[PDB]
Design a protein around this ligand. Structure first.
Ligand SMILES: CCOc1noc2cc(OCCC3CCN(c4ccc(C)nn4)CC3)ccc12
Ligand SMILES: CCOc1noc2cc(OCCC3CCN(c4ccc(C)nn4)CC3)ccc12
Ligand SMILES: CCOc1noc2cc(OCCC3CCN(c4ccc(C)nn4)CC3)ccc12
Lengths: 280, 251, 237, 36, 280, 237, 36, 280, 237, 36
């Protein structure tokens, strides 16, 4: 009875509007005090004579799972492949944040704390700078805090003995995999009002340190100059979040900091000015 | 209750200060069962003439001694019926009770680590394409002293690096092996019982040493006493020893 | 091997899919959930909280706190407009508010809106205001009579500072567009029902605050990216 | 009609999107009421 | 009831910490003798007043199956393809060891004996040295001790009448296959304290001889110079191991030998020196 | 042929997957298992065994066996520090030890640690030492008073050589990082509760050994490659 | 909820990763106790 | 109970060795006469005092199905593609034999008669002789005795109205298909002691005539010179065989004939000479 | 279309796979099986038949029939060796024989071997021979005493020409390698227990034949291509 | 545990490798015995 009721997307329903009648009384529901910190309780039927209407509408789409459960780009890593003995270079390293791309960052920053499993999806594209391409295989390895970080296209750490790596080669479809919620605490921190042991680095910098995503081109020395741009996409699965905050009003400056100020530019919200308030 | 008496052969050992005793890997030695067997001939089980305490030539512990080791069955090569049974057959299997003995005074201090390690494959002394020569891992009852001297035939020698457990591994993780400590203020004896352990039901007593006994002092022997030098003695008794595939005597 | 036949769409990355996928951290056991107050299950929980509308958006008050209050005068005896607002919810001024910003994350609109007003004047100051929602298909009302002919609440300031009135969902179609652009949802217009009266020696001018939330009525659909935020440059590591 | 769903994987996180369960407020945002 | 309990990864649990109280007694659990060879029995509650805490943590991930059950690189075979009548050459041969790459070698060398089935996974990559590539097909044949070893890209043995071979061609996805535990004894030997019949070759050299992995390029003579680098990856499945040993402290010199000494280089552990022991 | 639809991830080699795969040696029947003593089922079995900490890591004692003992003096009557240690477990000095090396194969940390100490002095020598774990958010204790204000054990040398004390898992979060780098787990500091007393004609100096294992408490998660070992060159065939 | 598993192959080794069964020590590393 | 017992590969078991005792008697089991043509009945326990051993070993792998049930190469057809109006040529024809490649031939020639279904597997490879390849599609048609044999890349017979053909194109995976046991008699003849109606052609030539495998390149005239080498592989499925014969001792000369003699070469078995018989 | 996910190995040709595959000759109905004597179900059926060992492999007897017999002399009164053989079964000389050639099709070895000997001398000729298997870890026995200390059979020629003796499977490990190369399985050595005695006017020299088969004991595993046969050139159509 | 097998095809020969059935000699190679 819930394989059916969610196939037409109807669990979680909106109340009906009831009929209402001329009121004359000492009961003033329209009158409250917003000083209490409480939002008013008034409903359409309280202040106006309403008809009966059976409301078929649904909040399913508005659920935390629907809203965070769409993937969007969190990082773009460009690998410019050189041939200067080819092994001294040609690897990405990225410290892992939801904080470097504004669109998904704004969404999760709607809440103070969030918790969820992650679906990472990869979209690699080879920009061909030579007459041709040949056979390009790529490796992406997750290198958690403390794991040995690769210093060359060369080094042993791509052996990936216990680390997780995923391989892509030209013509293979977009890689994907899932992550279990990785924090050391009960939820991820979207904001942090504290510093490190050394009394430095205010903010999220301290909290979630996932380590790094490292990329390397694995095909051995060859003749074609190419660029490989792998874009990283992230869906949240299985979600809870707590303590809603107001939405970010201004462009994002820097990751892990709420800093909004920008050099020689007026501080600019999304509000739009009017000539005069008696006209809309 | 710090007393121990172990009787094996016609032999009985006694120690009035011991720390419990350890049974290797939690399993007492047994004879080889029908389910696990491979060699289809009837094993020979010398019983009391074989499973008895053989005690080897003693070694001397000084202010300078940095360690020693022995290999089994090798150390028993020339010992009695166990020895002879060793070279008359292709195959043999045995467990052992190892009893290491060092006594001193309440006026001495020192500490030994006594470890029995399985498949202790030691490391060559030098770099490159060397290996260790048969003779050097088959010393007999005398064992290897760690000596700072230059040696006969070095491309064939094993490392002298004892704190590397001779195997290229950190001493002091040497514990995951069955072991005791002889610490003079506390005890006098160490005692270890081991079961056959090997990935095969019986192996060659000649070409393979299942165990190595290694004792290296992790606390240097200090005293104000006139006797500033004391002996360590090893006695080991085979247990449930059996042999098969008999033929003539290998030399 | 089972005979099987491949279908249009295969190989494709669709942002909004949900399929399974091997876990890259097998056997990993995540940290205990614990109790934190204030869980949100559904976005509408937020749309239902009073937010302050930036009712005074003139260039002159813009980046201050004064954008959030309107000023009433004892100097006026008259049926004068005080202010007005487009009622669509992703619209200006109300786009900035909780309910707006969230509505701005969807393309579809429906429900009734709760506009509450708090009078911040002296305890001894008094006024009666008219609050009016004039439904669509007509122009913003230019006079008190014109406004009052629609859905209204006459508000009397007294012991309780606040009053809430509601714009009923009244519309051709069940839902509306959050970015209509040409079409309107109607207007909400504030006037003087009487006059702002004062005693001797008390400030002649008093302020007025304005809030919005959604009613039980309210719902949003078809999730889209927000128009109220952008990324110009790149974000620092 | 209705639809078919099995989980093909050994780990929690591999599983697809979760099912929806009711808003069930409590009114803790809108009315956290000390005397109701 | 074990499809469920392992989907959230909860079989194998950690004990709770019980509350504890001020002790005054002749029973001294903190006092033992480590001379016995026995590790102490003391628990937090024995030496300090502890609270009750319900421990939700899990040892699943620490199981032998989790730890060895990740694939890592055990060999890298480069095939440089020549055209000097093309048939005299162009084949790999590799004697099969877990011993030539340090990362997985260290892990299994945590134990004296090990037993398990194997999953071999292949990652071939063609480095293009000509204007193009064309159609490259490769063959990998397992050649157990005693089987005829191919001496030319040519020879009959690639007929592979009874041997197992697996084929890869450009654009095909990473080959994979399983092996059953192959030793002639009850377990594989990670270390061996003995020699051969001839009293020579100390160590593992003697024990596990799996024969060899032989590679050949099968596409017939053609014009493009290329290199093919097939990397071999190995997961352990279905695992038991016995007799833990201390972990390798030093770089690996040579396969099948524990030799650690290196020419004109100080012998260097992973321990790190301090100025003085009263400061951390 | 059954209609079927291909999904993101397909074709991919993921190191940590487990899927089936044809066996290349069909019908092969593997050798009997037999009984070998000392099976290990789970890594924690190892973390639970006492290992010796390289407590004296000075450049001067480094590659000897003396790195593993500390020396006590009868020459001192005083509340002097003897040594100290970072308590995080993948940390130096303890990284080299059983429990460390293994913890170094995971990224996550939790449990209580068992530090046992064996006194190797003359049977007739005596001392009383203070062993102290000072919890994080403060600096390594500089004085006996400062140290003792934390979790401690006063140890009296007598017939039994050894004592075990434990650093409780006390931490903000349920787990910790095995490579924290900036954050600390606290310190463990050894002092003189009285003095090392000796008779006539017995060595004036006596040694002290130090061990670690994990308690029933202990657990590791998120497997990663080890930082305590590397491959510089290539390995000989 | 829970998950589905079948073996598709004729040989032991083809099968995927094994299931976990309890530590069940015995204490043979930590306490191999001759008199307990 | 046979989904299980064959998953660990245990149906078909080897007997146990029983304990045995000192014998003194008139019964001499070691003494027989091999003149009878009978192999001796003696078992270990008869001539020596043996222990009890429980034998876990298995003959599964030694079954006829295991032994013939691995594919190996039976033919290699090279198609050199010319462009001399392209249609006069460019087709393989092969008369079908298990007799042209020694490795599988030796195995089946272990028996006098054999019967089984066949799995043919194809491994085509394009050797590129031009700057490129383009789109190569190939056709393989089975042309049983009497069916019209194609004489040109051209001719109608590739219409394959009732014949079986299988198509391969570059990038497609290795074709495979099954055949039902095709002989006109109850089994295939590995050897034949008779001639044809005309008293000629001694041997297997007469017996199994399967007709021919015909190959053609189907892509229409184009500019790239290439070679296509399709190797044919054959597994036996569902097997019985009768009358074991001794194994072939010498190299194979010719198909369908047992001829072993070779020109100006000593006749050379696989036996290896010793200096003297009192030394091994 | 059903969502499905592709796995490592796909596309691959593995020689030793068994999967299904469309039949190219659908509906075809194969010829009746009929009864032919002598079906073989299992390879071991062959290993169990007596084959003649090429015991005399000297360059001098090589391609004759005399490679298959050994010659005994009445001229000798002595404990002399007659011949010897490596006992591994893929080894020379026995590789050529039924059981060898087949063992040569596998990489693994186990069981007991049955060596039978037929005396071809005059009905009136007599001898007693010693047949000895000396187990591994020692050198081929150089003297009668040395040989006899192992597993043996003293054979007395009389009315029944033949005797069978057996080399027990005696080995470290459950299986052995069919191509060991360095390691040995032991030796089998034939000596004079007494002397070959003859009447007046009967040939002074008599021959001896040698056979091998496997016992109920015997098993082979891990199929590999044979080393005892090759293809140098190409084979004529 | 055990394993799953279905035949997907209409013809005998398409089917995969056959199952094994016992050696069940008779001794016709080793002892074809006219008087036993
Ligand atoms: C071999 C593949 O490895 C990876 N490729 O791409 C990857 C991406 C990964 O992160 C998963 C999503 C995480 C990002 C971390 N994150 C946070 C945490 C705290 C804050 C304040 N903001 N964002 C929470 C969820 C993990 C691994 C890989
Ligand atoms: C047609 C494909 O053939 C193969 N390609 O790659 C392959 C890899 C193979 O080995 C599987 C894993 C084995 C390696 C041997 N190994 C050991 C044994 C002893 C020691 C001391 N160290 N390591 C234990 C497990 C087997 C066959 C192929
Ligand atoms: C459109 C595909 O057509 C074919 N491509 O490759 C093919 C291969 C085919 O033969 C299947 C195996 C057969 C070979 C004939 N053979 C024998 C018979 C007698 C003797 C003495 N030796 N060998 C027995 C089994 C049949 C058709 C095709």
């Amino acid at each position: 009875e819930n394989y059916i009721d969610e196939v037409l997307n109807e669990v979680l329903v909106v109340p009906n509007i009831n009929s209402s009648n001329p009121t004359t009384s000492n009961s003033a529901p329209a009158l409250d005090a917003a000083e209490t910190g409480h939002t008013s309780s008034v409903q359409p039927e309280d202040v106006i004579e309403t008809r009966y209407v059976q409301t078929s509408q649904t909040r399913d789409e508005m659920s935390l799972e629907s809203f965070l459960g769409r993937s969007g780009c969190i990082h773009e890593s460009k690998l410019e492949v050189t041939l200067a003995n080819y092994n001294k270079e040609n690897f990405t390293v990225w410290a892992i944040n939801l904080q470097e791309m504004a669109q998904i960052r704004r969404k999760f920053e709607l809440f103070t704390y969030t918790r969820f499993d992650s679906e990472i999806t990869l979209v690699p594209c080879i920009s061909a700078l030579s007459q041709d391409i040949g056979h390009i295989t790529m490796q992406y390895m997750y290198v958690p805090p403390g794991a040995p970080v690769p210093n060359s296209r060369d080094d042993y750490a791509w052996q990936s003995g216990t680390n997780a790596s995923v391989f892509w080669q030209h013509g293979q479809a977009y890689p994907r995999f899932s992550l279990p919620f990785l924090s050391v605490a009960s939820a991820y921190y979207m904001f942090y009002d504290g510093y490190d042991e050394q009394d430095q680095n205010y903010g999220t910098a301290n909290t979630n340190n996932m380590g790094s995503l490292c990329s390397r081109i694995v095909t051995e020395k060859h003749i074609h100059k190419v660029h490989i741009m792998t874009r990283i996409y992230h869906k949240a699965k299985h979600v809870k979040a707590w303590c809603p905050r107001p939405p970010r009003a201004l462009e994002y400056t820097r990751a892990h900091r709420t800093n909004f100020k920008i050099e020689d530019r007026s501080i600019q919200t999304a509000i739009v000015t009017r000539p005069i308030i008696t006209t809309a | 209750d710090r007393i121990i008496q172990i009787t094996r052969g016609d032999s009985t050992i006694t120690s009035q200060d011991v720390a419990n005793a350890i049974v290797a890997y939690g399993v007492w030695p047994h004879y080889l069962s029908s389910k696990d067997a491979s060699a289809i001939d009837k094993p020979s089980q010398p019983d009391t003439s074989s499973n008895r305490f053989y005690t080897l030539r003693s070694v001397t512990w000084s202010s300078s001694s940095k360690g020693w080791w022995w290999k089994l069955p090798d150390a028993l090569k020339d010992m009695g019926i166990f020895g002879e049974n060793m070279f008359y057959h292709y195959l043999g299997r045995s467990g052992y009770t190892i009893h290491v003995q060092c006594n001193a005074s309440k006026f001495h201090q020192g500490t030994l680590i006594v470890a029995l390690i399985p498949e202790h494959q030691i490391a060559s002394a030098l770099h490159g394409n060397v290996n260790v020569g048969y003779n050097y891992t088959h010393p007999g009852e005398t064992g290897r002293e760690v000596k700072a001297e230059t040696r006969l035939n070095p491309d064939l020698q094993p490392t002298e690096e004892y704190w590397l457990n001779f195997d290229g591994t950190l001493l002091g993780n040497i514990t995951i092996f069955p072991h005791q400590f002889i610490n003079l203020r506390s005890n006098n004896s160490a005692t270890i019982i081991a079961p056959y352990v090997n990935a095969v039901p019986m192996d060659s007593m000649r070409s393979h040493n299942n165990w190595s006994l290694v004792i290296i002092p992790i606390c240097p022997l200090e005293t104000s006493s006139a006797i500033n030098t004391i002996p360590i003695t090893i006695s080991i008794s085979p247990m449930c020893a059996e042999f098969s595939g008999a033929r003539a005597k290998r030399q | 091997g089972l005979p099987v036949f491949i279908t249009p769409g295969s190989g494709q990355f669709l942002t909004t899919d949900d399929f399974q996928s091997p876990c890259a951290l097998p056997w990993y056991h995540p940290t205990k959930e614990i109790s934190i107050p204030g869980e949100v299950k559904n976005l509408v929980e937020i749309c239902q909280v009073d937010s302050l509308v930036p009712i005074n958006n003139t260039d002159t008050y813009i980046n201050s706190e004064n954008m959030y209050s309107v000023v009433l005068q004892s100097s006026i005896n008259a049926p004068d407009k005080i202010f007005s607002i487009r009622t669509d919810v992703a619209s200006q001024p109300l786009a900035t508010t909780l309910i707006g910003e969230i509505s701005s994350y969807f393309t579809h609109w429906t429900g009734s809106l709760r506009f509450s007003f708090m009078f911040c004047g002296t305890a001894n100051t008094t006024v009666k205001l008219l609050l009016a929602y004039t439904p669509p298909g007509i122009a913003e009302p230019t006079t008190r009579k014109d406004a009052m002919l629609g859905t209204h609440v006459i508000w009397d300031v007294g012991l309780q500072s606040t009053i809430s009135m509601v714009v009923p969902w009244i519309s051709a179609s069940h839902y509306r567009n959050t970015s209509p652009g040409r079409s309107t949802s109607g207007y909400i217009t504030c006037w003087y029902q009487t006059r702002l009266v004062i005693p001797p020696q008390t400030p002649p001018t008093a302020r007025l605050l304005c809030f919005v939330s959604g009613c039980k009525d309210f719902c949003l659909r078809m999730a889209r990216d927000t128009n109220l935020h952008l990324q110009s440059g790149a974000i620092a590591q | 009609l209705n639809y078919f769903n099995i989980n093909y994987f050994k780990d929690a996180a591999s599983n697809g999107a979760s099912k929806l369960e009711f808003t069930q407020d409590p009114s803790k945002f809108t009315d956290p009421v000390k005397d109701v």
